[PDB]
C-alpha cells in the first residue's frame, strides 16, 4: 500500500504511522498495571466487567460472515467497549488527529476511531484496548510533553507551550519534573489522582520532534511546498466535483 503522497519528512512519517510493517519506535517502558491505571476503567486485580455473555454461550444461527470474521479476544469474552483519547500539540507533536485515525484503522482490528481538532479517540473491547494502549503510550505515537492522555477537558492542542515545553492541561494530568527532566502521569485520563505516579520518560528534544512530526507548518515543512501532496488533494476536489455533476 502507498498510504499518502508527498516527498517531505511529514509525508513519510504519515505513511510510517499507517503502515503496519513499519516498526513504531519504542521510546519508553510502561508496566501493564500502569497502562490500566492510566486508562482508569478498572482497578488493579478487578475482573473485566462484561456487557454481554461470552460468544460461546450464545445460540447464534449460521451466518457466513460471522463465521469468516474472527472476533477479537475481548469480543469473545463479552468485555465492555472502553476508550483511550489523546490530544496532540500543534507545536510538532509526533502524531496528530487524522494521522491517528487513519493509522488505527490500518493497524488495529475491531476499532472505532474518532478525529477532532483537540482530541482523538479509539473505542474497542476492554482487554484489546489495554494491549493497543500500551503501544500508543510506549511508542512514537506519544511524547509526554507535546501529547496528553485526556478523556475530558481536552483544551491545549492550539495553545502556547509552557516554560517547560509542556502542553496546557486544565487538569494537569502530566507533570514535568525538573529534577529528572522526565514527565510523570499523576492522574488518570479522566483526571482522578493516581496512588502513585507513572514515569513517562523524557520529552523529545526539538531535533527529534522535527524528525518525527506529522504536522506541516511554515516553521517546519510547509504543506504548500509538498507540491505532490497538494496535487493529490486538488485532484480529489476536482474529481469529486465533476462526479457529482455528471
Amino acid at each position: 500500500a502507498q498510504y499518502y503522497p508527498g516527498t517531505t519528512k511529514v509525508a513519510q512519517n504519515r505513511r510510517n504511522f499507517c503502515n503496519p510493517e513499519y516498526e513504531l519506535e519504542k521510546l519508553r517502558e510502561i508496566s501493564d498495571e500502569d497502562v490500566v491505571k492510566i486508562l482508569g476503567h478498572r482497578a488493579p486485580g478487578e475482573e473485566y466487567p462484561s456487557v454481554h455473555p461470552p460468544l460461546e454461550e450464545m445460540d447464534e444461527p449460521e451466518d457466513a460472515i460471522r463465521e469468516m470474521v474472527e472476533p477479537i479476544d475481548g469480543a469473545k469474552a463479552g468485555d465492555r467497549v472502553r476508550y483511550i483519547q489523546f490530544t496532540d500539540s500543534m507545536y510538532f507533536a509526533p502524531a496528530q488527529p487524522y494521522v491517528r485515525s487513519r493509522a488505527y484503522l490500518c493497524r488495529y482490528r475491531g476499532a472505532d476511531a474518532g478525529t477532532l481538532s483537540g482530541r482523538q479517540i479509539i473505542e474497542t473491547r476492554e482487554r484489546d484496548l489495554e494491549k493497543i494502549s500500551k503501544e500508543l503510550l510506549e511508542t512514537e505515537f506519544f511524547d509526554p510533553a507535546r501529547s496528553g492522555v485526556r478523556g475530558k477537558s481536552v483544551h491545549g492542542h492550539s495553545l502556547r507551550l509552557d516554560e517547560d515545553g509542556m502542553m496546557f492541561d486544565m487538569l494537569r494530568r502530566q507533570i514535568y519534573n525538573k529534577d529528572t527532566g522526565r514527565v510523570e502521569m499523576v492522574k488518570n485520563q479522566i483526571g482522578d489522582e493516581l496512588d502513585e505516579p507513572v514515569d513517562l520518560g523524557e520529552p523529545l528534544d526539538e531535533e527529534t520532534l522535527m524528525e518525527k512530526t506529522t504536522i506541516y507548518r511554515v516553521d517546519g515543512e510547509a504543506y504548500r511546498d509538498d507540491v505532490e501532496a497538494v496535487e493529490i488533494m486538488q485532484r480529489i476536489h476536482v474529481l469529486r466535483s465533476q462526479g457529482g455533476f455528471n
Binding site: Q2, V69, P71, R102, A111, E231, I232, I236, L239, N246
Partner: protein, 442 residues
C-alpha cells in the same frame, strides 16, 4: 439492453447461483421480486392483540404514561383471536380469494396482516395499510364483544393511539416498517424511513440478508426520488448489485480474505488490487514513489469501492462484534482509499460526509443515538444516495449485545411479524432468483 454489464450472482453462502445476469435484471424497475418486496412492505402491518387487550384493561391509551381512570374495559381479545381476526379479514379483503393475509402468531397475541395489493393500486400512498387494518380490528373487537357506543372510543384509542390529536399514531398497538408520510424529509423518501433495527430484526440478524434488504430499500428509494434517472442510473444499479447483492462474490471474497486478521486498511489494499486486476482502474501518472490511479468507468470504480466498504464494515465491526465503529469505518475507509489511489471515494465523498456526521451523532450529546436507530430518512444519514445505511444494517446484524437500543429493544413486534415473510427475511435469495428468471427479457 440499456447497459451491457453483466454480473454473477451468488447465495448467502458464497455459492454461485447464476452467471452473466444483465445488470437491469436487478433493477427495481424490472425485477419482480423487488416489486413484491416493496409492495409487501407497503401493505404489511403487525397487530399486537395482547397489547390492545392490556391497554384496554388498564385504560393506558394515548402515549407514554397516559391513563384515563374510570375507562377500563376488560375484553377477552386474545382468547377470541381467531374470531376477531377472521372478522377483520372479511373487512380488509377486497374479494374472498385475493392476496389478503391475516395470520395469528404467538397463540393469538399477535397477527400478521397483509392488506390486499389492490387497495394500493387505487391509493396515492401506503397509509391504507395501517388505517384499513386499524379500523377492521377496532370494528371486529367491538362486534365480538358488543362493545357499547359509550365505550367503543376506548378500543379505537387502544389500537391507533392519540391520532388525530397527534400527527403520528402515538401509543398505537399496531406497527409497520414504514412511517407516516408527513415525516418524510423530502418527497420520495418513504422507503428510506425504515429503522435499521427493523431491517436487522426482519432478517434475523443474517448479515448478508440485512445488507441486501437495506440496499434494496435504499436503492429503490433512489429511483422514486429521481436520483437513479438518466446519467446516474447505472451508478445506482451497480451499487445495488455490488454493495448489496454480493455481485461477483466480491464482498464475500474480501471478507473471506480479511476475516481472520484483517483491518479496514487490509481490505482497502485487497480491493485496490482487485480493481486493478479487473481493469476497473489503471495507473494514470507516477509521482515520486506514488502511483496516481485513474478510471474510464467511474460508476464501476464506485461500485467496487462500495463492495470494499461493505466488506470493511463486516471485517471491522465483525471483529469487534460491536456496531458502533461502523461510523468510523464509513469515514476512514473512504478517507484512506482516496489518499491510497488519487480516486474519489464512494458516492464522491458523500459516504465519508455522512460518516462524519453519523460519527458525531453517535458519540455526542446533541442528537442521534446508537447505529440501529438511524435510517435513510434520518437527517444525519440521508446524504449518501444509498451507499451508507446498508453498512449500518450489516454492522447491527453483527452486534453481539453492546447496544441499549438494540433490535430486541426497538423492534420486537416488527421482528415477530415481518420475519415470517420469506421475501422480507431472505430477500437476497428471491431477488437473485427473479433476476435469473428475467435474464432473457432485458
Amino acid at each position: 439492453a440499456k447497459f451491457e454489464d453483466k454480473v454473477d450472482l451468488y447465495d448467502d453462502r458464497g455459492n454461485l447461483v447464476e452467471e452473466q445476469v444483465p445488470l437491469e435484471a436487478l433493477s427495481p424497475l424490472r425485477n419482480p421480486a423487488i416489486k413484491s418486496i416493496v409492495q409487501g412492505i407497503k401493505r404489511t402491518v403487525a397487530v399486537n392483540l395482547e397489547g390492545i387487550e392490556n391497554a384496554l384493561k388498564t385504560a393506558k391509551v394515548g402515549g407514554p404514561a397516559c391513563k384515563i381512570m374510570g375507562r377500563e374495559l376488560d375484553l377477552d381479545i386474545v382468547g377470541n383471536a381467531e374470531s376477531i381476526a377472521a372478522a377483520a379479514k372479511e373487512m380488509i379483503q377486497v374479494t374472498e380469494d385475493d392476496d389478503t393475509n391475516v395470520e395469528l402468531l404467538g397463540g393469538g397475541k399477535r397477527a400478521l396482516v397483509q392488506v390486499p395489493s389492490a387497495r394500493f393500486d387505487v391509493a396515492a400512498e401506503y397509509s391504507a395499510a395501517p388505517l384499513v387494518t386499524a379500523t377492521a380490528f377496532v370494528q371486529a373487537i367491538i362486534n365480538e364483544f358488543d362493545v357499547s357506543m359509550y365505550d367503543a372510543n376506548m378500543v379505537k384509542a387502544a389500537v391507533l393511539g392519540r391520532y388525530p390529536q397527534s400527527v403520528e399514531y402515538m401509543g398505537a398497538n399496531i406497527a409497520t416498517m414504514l412511517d407516516i408520510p408527513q415525516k418524510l424529509e423530502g418527497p420520495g423518501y418513504a422507503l428510506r424511513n425504515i429503522m435499521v433495527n427493523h431491517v436487522v430484526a426482519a432478517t434475523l440478524k443474517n448479515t448478508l440478508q440485512a445488507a441486501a434488504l437495506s440496499t434494496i430499500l435504499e436503492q429503490t428509494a433512489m429511483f422514486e426520488m429521481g436520483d437513479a434517472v438518466g446519467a446516474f442510473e447505472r451508478m445506482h444499479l451497480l451499487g445495488l448489485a455490488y454493495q448489496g447483492m454480493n455481485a461477483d462474490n466480491l464482498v464475500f471474497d474480501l471478507v473471506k480474505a480479511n476475516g481472520k486478521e484483517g483491518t479496514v486498511g487490509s481490505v482497502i489494499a485487497d480491493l485496490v488490487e482487485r480493481a486493478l486486476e479487473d481493469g476497473v482502474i489503471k495507473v494514470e501518472k507516477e509521482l515520486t514513489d506514488y502511483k496516481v490511479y485513474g478510471t474510464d468507468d467511474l460508476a464501476m470504480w464506485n461500485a467496487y469501492a462500495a463492495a470494499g466498504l461493505m466488506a470493511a464494515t463486516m471485517v471491522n465491526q465483525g471483529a469487534a462484534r460491536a456496531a458502533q465503529g461502523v461510523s468510523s469505518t464509513l469515514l476512514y475507509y473512504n478517507d484512506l482509499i482516496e489518499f491510497e489511489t488519487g480516486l474519489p471515494s464512494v458516492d464522491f465523498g458523500k459516504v465519508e460526509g455522512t460518516a462524519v456526521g453519523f460519527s458525531f451523532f453517535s458519540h455526542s450529546i446533541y442528537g442521534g443515538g446508537g447505529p440501529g436507530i438511524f435510517n435513510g430518512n434520518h437527517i444525519v444519514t440521508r446524504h449518501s444516495k444509498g451507499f451508507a445505511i446498508p453498512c449500518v444494517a450489516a454492522a447491527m446484524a453483527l452486534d453481539a449485545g453492546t447496544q441499549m437500543f438494540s433490535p430486541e429493544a426497538t423492534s420486537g413486534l416488527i421482528k415477530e411479524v415481518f420475519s415470517q415473510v420469506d421475501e422480507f427475511r431472505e430477500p437476497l435469495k428471491y431477488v437473485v432468483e427473479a433476476a435469473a428468471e428475467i435474464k432473457n427479457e432485458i
